[model samples]
Target: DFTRVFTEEDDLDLVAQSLPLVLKVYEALHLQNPAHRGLSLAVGRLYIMYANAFVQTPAQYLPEDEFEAQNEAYSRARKLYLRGARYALSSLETAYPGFTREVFSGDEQRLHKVLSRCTRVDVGTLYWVGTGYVAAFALTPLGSALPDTVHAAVMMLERACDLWPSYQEGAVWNVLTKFYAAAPESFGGGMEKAHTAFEHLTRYCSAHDPDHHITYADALCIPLNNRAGFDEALDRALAIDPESVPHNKLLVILSQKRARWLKAHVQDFFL
Candidate 1:
């Protein structure tokens, strides 16, 4: 139903206006069939997409002086992200009872035990659920106790990547780059892991998709204070032709928007 329209359409404004209606349609269908993994995953992924593309991206473009409004938008985005995460997790729960419980258990042994049962078939569900939760947690204020409940998110992402490294055209790798670059070393994040995941991400979409490069610049270079590296990554992203990958038209446009924003705000990033 929504699968074709999302990928084939290039009009962001139109999509944003209609996404809520479509999401509710699927939600209603899922209510009728609570155990339908397909409906759950689809609805979950759509909500996350709406939050990221419409809500969070716009907020991120707001000027520093608009911190109040920015934070407000981020809070809304976080709510949507968590809402999406619940559906995705529900999909997994339907597939394997107690999956969501074990994920939030915050016990590595238990999480791993549950993850070990997942196969490539579950990679999509794992990716959406993991990335959704992690993205939501990222929006919370520091010391918000989200980290205590977020370990499973990254663990599930890692397991998904292990099962399917190039799932969703390297989407998992992009999220990993952000996680590794933003997270502290004690929490299993470092430039090393970020770079490694960046490599894998590029291997899948370097020439075709611009988001990988933009993500690397935003996550890895900006944190490392590598202005030259940041410039190079953004430059490469801008050099890409959106038409070169017709199917990725929406993705390329989104990445280019961020790349331009990052370049314009270069002064804010580097001292």
Candidate 2:
């Protein structure tokens, strides 16, 4: 309920300024009622959301000369993402006593066995927790200990997708598109899978949601060096009128900003 107020707010600056304190409020509530499933989920989801939308995103657009500041912000975002994953794992632990341990065990068999027990009710937790791990790994992956767990984390997202393909306006599909396109073959990634997920993402999500197009451009086009495809994807993203999708206006606005930035920096990517 409280999340609606943030999610629906179109002004990025306003939400960025106030979300930390609001997250603290949620943290305090969770501290008192640790077993509260909904609050736990909200806390986890909000932290990840803040890291992605505010911290990591803005850091990415920093001037190229500001590498230090960008790295600092990305580091902070990575920590925030892990913290969110921890909260989500805790929420899952409360629901299924052994979930946290097995998920982190880094054994494919155990991961598969644990996931098999999760029902539809656990889809959201599975998604946010999996996404949190993947996001953090993306931020700082070289020589890190997360490589062993990355496969398990991706598996969690895949399982969530299997359970609820259309969860969160095809958010699972969106993440899958990026993962499959961007990650190496050894990490269960492939361009073919990414394209399939992109199709599903576009099919399940709204035509007015610019994120699908933006994601496809970022994940698929850039890698293949397809300049025309990149241009077309961002064009479609920029063409989306945010007001037409009031429920997701903030996402559209933010994604269009990214699309514009990518277009402006097209030369850097091509070479």
Candidate 3:
């Protein structure tokens, strides 16, 4: 009933006002009442939703000085997000013992089951897992936890790609491609992997929605330093969707700026 209470449209304002109370309830459920396993799981998921509201929504209202002073706020929010993910995994462990370890160890069967459970709740859960792993990996230190982080990220994203490749406006593949392209090979990241992922995305988009070319172009050119790839992506982007949406029109202009910069500095980099 707590979930129902929270979901009511009329109580929207009240819920917004009592966000702190909701967080506290989830925290207590996570910390205590471990015996009430189902409640704990439900509460842990609620906590994650609450934490994400803070984490993803950038603080633009705060004065620059106040925002600078509150730099730790984002960090705290991220900690809560991780806690939510941890508790969600913990709940799974309780429900299906050793689930988390099996998932972490790349046990395909366990991973498939876990993904299936999450997908039953919401297919977007797969994408959130991928997003959460990436965030945790970014926040964690390199030398101490890089290997584990890489494993977590790759596994989660791979599971997501396998289960629900079309979520997030086809942004899941975009994330995978970008992560692999930018990450170093020694650290379990590779451009080749990224390129392959991008190809998959391109194929999917070409089949389903060729109009999403801006995304395709951005995904392609952002990783490659090669002029040929850059031009090819740009051309494809413009060819498919030249008018552009409000969100991506700026990106078009920015891409142009980059092109100009590349032209001006072409000799500087090569020579």
Candidate 4:
């Protein structure tokens, strides 16, 4: 029953339609069987995953609409995302009390204790909490709350990195690197760190992937404005996968054109 309900087609359609079915399930599970801790936690995590599937890929979901309508959709989506994050946190708290403080505060001793209580299969549970914290902060308003959000993202990323040095094909590190690089300097974020992360990603991807050279090049060059780095990276990418995807080749050409234009304009512009 759960498998049918969470089929890819069902999840995608529900997310596309912006229906909060995941949250509804959590609510129903909570009401029908308050003692079912696993069900509650599962429901909560499902909501978190649903919310992330939408929030992370907004370009796929949000489209041109009436100004008011667009705003309404975003608002609804944000609410759902936050609700999902909160539910996940709630579930974790119920299942393993004080898990958040231990994880957030870097209490390795307590974390070990907590982990001892969990099956090895649940070792990655902290990553979900970290993700939920980041999602919640992103959806929540900025102000006095901004620091908390940043802290949440950082903690989650760090925890994930520590727990699983190589999760999602080292994509977790890639994300952590990007987040650290993009975060404000005052908040312990910098381009230097991003570069470091990219370097790690480059090595990891290179070893595991044949066509990752170009992918790494695009990611670094487009975001960081390192044309020399971009050119070199592109060359390597092409060398490995000469017959790269059409879109990737197109991106290579576009990047080259931009580089040429920048070089030509260097004399006339302050850029």
lDDT of 4 by residue, 1-271 (tens): 6444333232355544644665576678776875565665566566666555554434223445654655554556556555655555555566777766764455557655655555433424445555555555544554544664456546556655666666655555565564565456676677677777666665554332423444444445556666676566545543443134322332233333334443444333332
Clashing pairs in 3: none
lDDT of each model, Cα atoms only?
0.86, 0.86, 0.56, 0.52
Best by TM-score: 2
RMSD (Cα, Å) for all candidates, in order, is 1.6, 1.4, 8.5, 8.0
Off by over 4 Å in 3: 1-19, 26-53, 56-74, 105-126, 167-171, 198-271
Worst 10 residues of 1 by lDDT: 141-150
Distance from true location, Cα of 49 in model 1, Å:
0.6
Residues 58-78, candidate 2: write the lDDT tens digits: 998899899999999999999
1-271: candidate 3 lDDT, tens digit per residue: 5454444323334655777777787668667776555655565556555654444333322456877534566566567667666665565556656667766765557665555554423334444555556655554556655565466656667776776776655666776776676566776778678778777776555422332443344444544545555555545544433243323333343334444444444444332
Candidate 4 has which clashing residue pairs, if any? none
From the highest TM-score down, the ranking of the candidates is 2, 1, 4, 3
Model 2 regions lying over 4 Å from their true place: none
Evaluated with lDDT, which candidate comes out highest?
2
lDDT of candidate 2 vs native? 0.86
Q: Per-prediction TM-score, please? A: 0.94, 0.95, 0.53, 0.58
